[PDB]
Design an enzyme around this catalytic site. Structure first.
Site, short mmCIF file in Angstrom:
data_model
loop_
_atom_site.label_atom_id
_atom_site.label_comp_id
_atom_site.label_asym_id
_atom_site.label_seq_id
_atom_site.Cartn_x
_atom_site.Cartn_y
_atom_site.Cartn_z
N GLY A 71 0.80 -1.20 0.00
CA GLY A 71 0.00 0.00 0.00
C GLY A 71 0.83 1.25 0.00
CE1 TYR A 119 -8.03 -5.89 -13.22
CE2 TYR A 119 -6.47 -4.09 -13.06
CZ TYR A 119 -7.16 -5.13 -12.49
OH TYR A 119 -6.97 -5.43 -11.16
CG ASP A 143 5.36 -1.93 -4.45
OD1 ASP A 143 4.13 -1.84 -4.62
OD2 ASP A 143 5.82 -1.78 -3.30
#
Lengths: 4, 121
Positions: B29, B64, B48
């Site tokens: 996060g 998406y 990441d």
């Protein structure tokens, strides 16, 4: 909201 | 998009992305430095890196489409960015599921200063  | 990723995480694990994954360890996060704390944190490290592979995409906001083929996540064809973002998120959601067995609440709200050092992707 979230950030990774 | 972040919101879609969060729904995918909940579907996969039964934990809410916020707060179970939104502030977990050194990479979840909020990404940047340190040795990942455990396997779940490593899922975030790799996620990441996966987003880092896509500097000219916008994974926080770009949406998406995907479907389930009994259980399995299948990314449907959108733009190149959307396809690649979906594959990154799919991998992370599967990774979270694969590592639920070691998920530890003590890593929620993990303090920044305990995350030191750069780890190369």
């Amino acid at each position: 909201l979230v950030r990774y | 998009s972040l919101l879609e990723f969060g729904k995918m995480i909940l579907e996969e694990t039964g934990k809410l992305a916020i707060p179970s994954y939104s502030s977990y360890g050194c990479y979840c996060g909020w990404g940047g430095k340190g040795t990942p704390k455990d396997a779940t944190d490593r899922c975030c490290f790799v996620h990441d890196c996966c987003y880092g592979n896509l500097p000219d995409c916008n994974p926080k906001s770009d949406r998406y489409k995907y479907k389930r083929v009994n259980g399995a996540i299948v990314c449907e064809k959108g733009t190149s960015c959307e396809n690649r973002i979906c594959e990154c998120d799919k991998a992370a959601a599967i990774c979270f599921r694969q590592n639920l067995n070691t998920y530890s609440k003590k890593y929620m709200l993990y303090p920044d200063f305990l995350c030191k050092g750069e780890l190369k992707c």
